[model samples]
Target chain A: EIPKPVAPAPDILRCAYAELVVTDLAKSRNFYVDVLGLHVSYEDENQIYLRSFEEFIHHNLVLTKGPVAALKAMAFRVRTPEDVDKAEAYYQELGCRTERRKDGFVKGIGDALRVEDPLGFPYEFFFETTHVERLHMRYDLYSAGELVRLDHFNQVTPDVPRGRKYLEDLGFRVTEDIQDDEGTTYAAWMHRKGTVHDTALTGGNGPRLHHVAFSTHEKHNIIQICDKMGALRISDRIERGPGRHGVSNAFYLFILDPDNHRIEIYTQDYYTGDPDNPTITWNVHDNQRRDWWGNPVVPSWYTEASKVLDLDGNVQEIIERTDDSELEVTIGADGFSFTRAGDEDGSYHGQASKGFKLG
Target chain B: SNEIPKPVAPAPDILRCAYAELVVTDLAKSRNFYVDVLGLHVSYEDENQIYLRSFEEFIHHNLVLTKGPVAALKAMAFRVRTPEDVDKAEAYYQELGCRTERRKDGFVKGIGDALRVEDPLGFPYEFFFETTHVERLHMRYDLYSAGELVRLDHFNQVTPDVPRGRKYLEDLGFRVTEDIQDDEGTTYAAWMHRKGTVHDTALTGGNGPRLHHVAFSTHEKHNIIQICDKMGALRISDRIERGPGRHGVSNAFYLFILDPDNHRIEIYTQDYYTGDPDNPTITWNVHDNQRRDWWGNPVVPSWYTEASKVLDLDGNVQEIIERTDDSELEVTIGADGFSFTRAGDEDGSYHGQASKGFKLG
Candidate 1:
């Protein structure tokens, strides 16, 4: 029962792009294109630039096919060209793999610098790109639906605190955190881009992506889709949710995309777009907030995710937290906070409570 | 002339169901469900939650859990070959009328939306522009593993109108390869494959469109038997809904279990991989086959009678659907005697008649 957050304007220069490695580029392409129907804004033997039909942004998807597909790397949208330069100098100073470009070799992008972090997650900072036709006009085709903008991403890392420090140092904001009661775990959810979680990291080494989420205009759209799945005879893909999440204060559901990827379509979170939003924290025992008033966590929700493969086909390593007590008690989830019981302010909404107040 | 490089196996259509994240009040409780009950072995654990995997699993984790006060679903994820593909899926689904989401570390985000559609049937259909891979299909599998649990498998849907629902899905490029029906020709259910194999399905003859259940496949029948036996030994045998059965459709050995929330979970196996462009369909006679339940056990009342109540956008339980007499909705499977994969194997009698390869090894 925390105080409602003041809505903030969308953030700029937020890291927004992802890079995946797939074994079959063409088969992957068809599923993304024909079955899924994304536009191939640009493509060559090595990469493809995909722009959402409704997006004014140049591209939302970047497909690379060459080696056995693995997530090669991903990039963040930057506010200014200068920020890109700052990122370059900083990473280079930290002994990371860094690259700067006057022209982005990939289509849709203007210019960017590629770099890797201490834990070895690859990243890019870019300032410009060409916007495509805003497909909102074809509202006829999309009358039943329309994705407004790109939203957030979640990833796994061995060291949650280390990952948090790395992003915070680079100008990201910590919204809330979830910490373990015992000295063993921690996760931090931060944003540089929007009210909903933009990019989040959880404790564990690598294999990376937990799930990527997109926003819908309302929670209804999410339900409408579930209905359609019912019509499609493909309802089992609706793995979990259609339930309210206590963390982001948003309605959510986890579904399996055609490629076996779990996609979360969520909306209505307490906006954290304010310039002075509090970076909330929670303890390990906070159950109410985790579920916004529900039961214990499901096993699949905690353990299911895709793994990462290096150039040589090896899983990346996670850096274990050295100090135990520092991250001991439960803190905040990656993107929001949790409290075991109602606080004096009545804002705390976690703990062994009645069913989730999600409704 | 250069010989063709073995046609490259079409890049293995999809990597397994990439990754998923969930929230829980008790980490131990979650671990027990996935590792002990579901059989996904623990890969790693920290203070918050533990990660688990099946032996044949190639990813870092098949599941992830975060400790919180209450249990909640965290995120549903996918694995694409390249970073650019994430961007492309963003563009494609955006074209379908979805709000695309992009995140750096979006595990907390739940699902990605490319269209208004959310789940495969439209709940919140999402796709990733990128991801990392862990391992590959191999035999490092465990004998106790519910066997392969293999891929993420397929999801199930319950809708009242079969033809209408099938039409919408077909328009979205989903192909219906198989279905069940009564002798009089009423469509009872249908199966649609996404990344090659049957990844999603729809059940008619039910309440208005609803989520019927979700299923993951195991490599053998004993995997299911072991689950029942193990749980039974632990005095948790009540969890078994039905199984160690053969079905008339899909030709797979299957079992169904319930989660703490009573969500339906199916442990299925033995369906052929439909990796070809011209796969054939096999219809079963209602009066002929002994299969449908290899053991001939009847599908429990709960299996056909239960489902998670759906919520509207506001998250309240939605209004119940009314079945109309003149309406075109499907209503013959549960109420009317329907003939499907195996016909005479009614009332859950003998495990259906076995095929040449009906090895429960």
Candidate 2:
């Protein structure tokens, strides 16, 4: 019975682009333009684009090609240009499934709409773009984890409180989540800009995707993108993290790319822009609820993701997850998960179902 | 004489590059290297200064330190967004003849009225617009650490005519986002800015009213490599002294260190957004060599020959001066110089990395 909020179709503003698809668009443009260096803003033979070094629009990654690796559309932007006709009459009065398109499905966007929501994903919205040429002081064409912008988008959603009540009735807010003392939820980070997330839902399956991030200006540029993916041996495309993120305490890494999608890299998180801020929950059997410094979340970031599309880009139709999974009640096999919970003191290690410690 | 001043009117809105003060000489080892190893936030202190502030500051300080007797800087200041911009910063530094003062209430602690000046290349500065707000600690991430330092990101100084201190900071409205020079054009450093990232003050050719470093910022590059891995786990990694690297002039993510009184501080991170108005700028090329480490390392000849001593709005110090231009260590590693991490190749040298033989011939 919850879901009330509604109204938010006026501006939106930050999140911007994603598009995806991949399947070797030159090996996902050589893992995002030759190893997370981002910034090309143009390519060919079926698409590429990129951007980030502090971007000024004109591409925040597009990729294209596809045969499997999905996503196509996640964008956001708005703030005028008739807020894309108020985001197509606010997602056609929330019954979802809309599409306007005055010319924009990429390439310096303009007048767009898209949508499909109600937990089916796709989403889009625009506000005339085409600014380009920022290269934030060029820094002689930066590289090495120099990413710069894109920042958020994660999503797997099998219903984390019905995708946090349709993204808090479209104005997005949450700021941190991951419940479970029987209530179960498991993931949600939302935001309308002001760091600490711009999208994130994650309970798994259904409208997949779980990773898009980008930003990087330190944490040794996410340890030199894991030392250039262990000097290009592709350290098994990383898969987990360069750590730190007891849910948006930020400084992360993730990896995957080359179409297994997932790409994070992120950076410090703070500043949740007032209006009573304070949200941070976490607990789904804590172990630093997704690494604060405890690490270990693998299992393909809780059973892989990336497969959304629809609005005609096809794919869509996933829907599986039914509640308890944080990789099956914390790495199932009799299920467990903790680092310090009952009878606590410190590092003791015992009853293990994946995740342990006591004293 | 190398003149440059020129303002007579507009220029006093500023509001960034807020605090510095410095002076050190062991105020509890510079308050345990800026509040227990670079976490910055104290906001109060005594026995002559301390102050601090930064996990996303709310004002009332961004660093102060004090104690003195030689370490230096004691000024840099800035902030001006009202209080009539401190009477438009003493009529824009007494119409550029410089050395003004004002003070109706601030001269430190929670600021106010201020003004100060001394400019035309001799450093000192100040400004103000009241202050004393405090408590921002941006969500207090449970008091952060692992090298926190959140704001106050600029102020370098030194001077010796960086195009006459970037035309007196472009008549105090500041702009020039990046520089370096030398294709026989000379310059050596520039940066400038008013509050847009890349820099809030720079100039830097060197030697003259000194200071050369104040910086701060940090949100990721792993909080500036966790202050050089907490200064190599507190063995004080020879007070770092240069780079965690990556900055071909403002691509940010830097380091620099040296304090326990040698002053200089840096830290930095990210660097972008120049508040448009044709933003563009950039430049570099003082014999390329990755123009200042885009991974070509080098630099560190005591960070282009030390710096520090500054003060004077009556705190004293001031007088040094000797630059006579042309020296980014005698045009890149003296002894008739040489440099190049590739630009028409000339034997591609950056010699044993961290400039061991200080490169030349």
Candidate 3:
């Protein structure tokens, strides 16, 4: 069997934070605090910041009250303030909609640019953060169940390859990809750090926030946390998952915050360390490739992501992907291919016997 | 500066049931019952738990299965359809002397100004009026989201005196659409629905006067069938309780199962049309199979063994219920093969093997 191809570069840094618009402050607060159990980091009449028990940042979730519900924006963190400025200048030169927010950096943000990406998602380039979301060091080994840093945010965009070009120009590299039989396409994972991505675009007709997954210490912590929920009469919150992903190899559980935003708590994904890590290709017909253990993928997991709206509260439409000549990068889709099963080097190779306890 | 009179939100015209939190020993085991078996898809997951919903739901999640502690029940989550209804309910409840609290860091405003009050008999209760609405993607039932979230369902409470506790929920704006009682008039079970459908219920059990179990709504009858089928496929068919049959009173498809922690989870769907300004309540016979599963399936032993313990403000254990000899409070089917519910036809046995309908699909 041929070895998986390598990315020319590494994936980007950790996921920063997500910005969401809510309509009811009290309801959202009760859901977050009373129902889901995140501690209230800070709160006012119009905005609030909530942190998970394991997070080191000031807040893992930031909620603001508005006329309607939406994922207003998303921001990713980088290594230094200099990298922030470099990204700002680079994107601005490319003619992408970029604006430098100066007086700007809150406790965590140093200097930055607020802009629209090729796919129309709002983002910020920042250097400083006063508080890091807590990692709960004491529970590291206990909570280390599949623990790692924030993995990636899935987005619904119009053209996957065009979005790929814009991201690559900004220093991101393609890692995992999906392609149809005749070479028609669907999605791809691009990175700047190593693992998967800072941001990934899911091919669709419009722009929306698909899902955001958080990194955990161990897989069992996921189960530890779930047991706490059951004891508290909040078992209704466990929405889906606790299954291994065929694509990422991450043990996952999709939970609902009080606001109904989908948050995936995942860990134990493969190392995205060096340039040697394979860039996995997928076919659309490969069943176990999506749910490697052979469980079928739930329909909602594919099509039902939270939709984002413009500042005006109107839904945003996106341009379609141009043909192959316009393709910025080639993505080999793995969902359809029948990869050699049981081969250690193949995507569907080797059965994992280790059991993980989900919280 | 002026002191704004706290508002009382109007209860949903058809406020249905109680919502409860379930604390379990294992999140994965609990998830299997609610998601894979019940077919309520995932909405999200954190380091600790998973949130799921039925195909027919539009809420963030009908159920939230989390980690931490022994298997127990947490809070009663409620929803009011309109923003104005929140204000109306807040003001009305305030007049009745319930303490209210304000919040700012939530998804919606007015939703935070809620009431946490102990009812006349000392049962814990809370009322809220806010939330954010997502795509209501219940129609995307065919599409697979890594996290497929559907809707929030109802909570089942174990009360000391079924009729008395049922009266309290009724006074607080919840309606009892279906009820079970003995010939001597001791109430056995009371099923309530909020926002026009079933969301919670009260079970007359002897273990404790606290919470019994919480149920999540599934879009189709086949979803519940999926649970039994998956359990059978996994060779855990003995875990099945009652049937994948219709309830004679609620007119809903129902099934009960025991999780790793022994909590009884009832996967129920498609009950009452119940949109009337004043819907009629239905009464059921004491020994009827149609009352529980509609089909003649036996209730399992573990489901009855696993009940949630209630907590005081300090987290101490609360009181439990006791069985009475005057009459049967509920359809008492021991571990032996006693049938629970029955359909309205002859040669129409509801017990035995699971359904092959959609599980085959």
Candidate 4:
């Protein structure tokens, strides 16, 4: 159930940085800085700050060394400094644990508040950030992926409808969604600054992170990420995708860091800034709802997600959701996913045909 | 100086680069590279010729590969805004004392009346107006390969003189967007554009009248990389002649793939706009390592030294005009000439031999 809070929610600007707990700083550095071409904003002995070429306020991502791999903070930028107090009171009235820091939980960010949200997820909000040089047209230092900025964060929740209500209260409008015939909401895409989404709620077991997506200017940069990953013998890190998403209409590539934390290099989604932005919903049974090109979604992408932490940095146990399962109802039976009804079943479970040899 | 006369008869209103006609030694082999590997759609094909179109093209084709004994470029064509502009192109070239041909039914299928000319720089060029629009198969991702060539980007021609060639193109309504030059007035290369994006044609300072390359656009950087992956899978990785790097001049991502006939085809994306009048022409230092490649990757030796032979109206190979001044490769990467990764750091250690195991000398 969504909480009806007495205090007002903060005015969120956009999805800001994602502080990730990486196991080894050096390996994470090689994957992010050396291989993926992200610029290192700042780095000390344990933590490394990173920013895409389009970012100006210090960093969009932070890799902090930790004993366990997890998502430390799902941070958002609030509009005003006073919004920090709004965030502190907003979650406190919901009886969720809240913490305020004059400095920040991480470097570059300032005047922040962290809270164990009603959904059992740690979300941080900040108003002040140290400005840094942007590599907008510094063509020389550009990486192959050409990541522009932090786009959105996807969260896995037991109930998509409840989380969607919570996010809409925080000033996001639903741009797109996935639903089945029984009125079961499978996924919800919510946007703040126009392009498709700044946050997505995927129907799953608990408050884990599906992915932290970074934006690229074009679809070409997403392919470059795959090619560069292949060159570095890390092609296996590509968890899923390099395909067009039917939901957002965005070209996407899902990659996993050394700690198995999922990241997505994304680009070229349709805008949704209009007040009359239509909320398009796709049938959960439609095979193209995941991949427009009809590429199969990998099993891991549906099942695996990074563990999210609380304000104390302790991992929260995943609560299960069994009734009306998105996966079980949609794909668990008969492998009934189909592009068109008239077309013969060419799914992996169906007649092998051209793909017979793999069996 | 063989000064070519410039006449503006039909005020040139060129749209963008339309197509390139090439004579290939083997039809099936070249078809494998363009159609099968790079994923350009075959608009029409036969034993003697193949008409190919890109994903976003509604025109009949962006490239024509014809059967011939020798591999060479037949002509590069530009689509003007109107049919009257084609009439102007013919009269303009004819007035300049250059051999011009006007065909009512077009030189190829799917195109209407066209004009072909052997311009002053001894290059084969054409202008056309009427075209049969086919379905722009952009939404047909099912027919698309991993490395899909979307649109015909531009053509690069090697000429002996950069300044004079740039001037002639400027006279033809192309704007100069960027250039590479040394302090002493030697312009090594110049990029000129009719399209909003960086270029419709580029002039490289090299041996004259040779076809440097014909570039095609992709949607993003990954499509260019996919071409490489497909090349590797197809056991033709050697065809990657140069780059897969960013160019400081145009600010576009680039990857060069050599076709079966030794013609260079470039896969490119993301060059910014030169749409407005008085667009500032960015000048880059000739000896800067990042000028050609923004990441300072070494230029492939063959890209500068060699180019496909161009053709004339009489189906004869055009003779080359050698540039007598400073060669760009010689001034930058020659044994004596040095280039710097950063300004003022002249390190000529291009050839690294770090191993001491085989120190015979």
Q: Total backbone clashes of model 2? A: 10
Worst lDDT run of 10 residues, candidate 1 chain B, spans: B2-11
After superposition, candidate 3 runs with Cα above 4 Å error: A1-12, A30-40, A52-57, A105-107, A132-135, A138-149, A224-239, A309-315, A318-359, B1-361
Q: What tens-digit string does per-residue lDDT give for candidate 3 at A79-158? A: 56666666666555555577676655333455666666556677666655555434332233333232334457888776
TM-score head-to-head 3 vs 4, winner: 4
Ranking by TM-score: 4, 1, 3, 2
lDDT of 1 by residue, B334-357 (tens): 333332334444453223322332
Scanning candidate 3 chain B in windows of ten residues, the lowest lDDT window is: B352-361
Q: Report, for every candidate in turn, its global Cα lDDT versus the true structure.
A: 0.54, 0.76, 0.55, 0.82
**Comparison by DockQ, 2 against 4, better one:** 2
Worst ten in a row by lDDT for model 4 chain B: B352-361
Sort candidate 3 into its docking category: incorrect
What TM-score number comes out for model 4?
A: 0.56
- Candidate 1, overall lDDT? 0.54
Return the lDDT, model 2, position B20: 82
Instruction: Write model 2 residue lDDT over A270-315, tens digit each, in one string.
Output: 6564333567687776777687666656777878787888888889
lDDT of 4 by residue, B180-276 (tens): 9889989999998875568999999899799999999887788888888888888889999887999888778999989988999998986654553
DockQ of each: 0.01, 0.13, 0.01, 0.05
Which numbered prediction scores highest in lDDT against the true structure?
4
State the RMSD for candidate 4: 12.3
Ranking by lDDT: 4, 2, 3, 1
TM-score of chain A of 1: 0.76
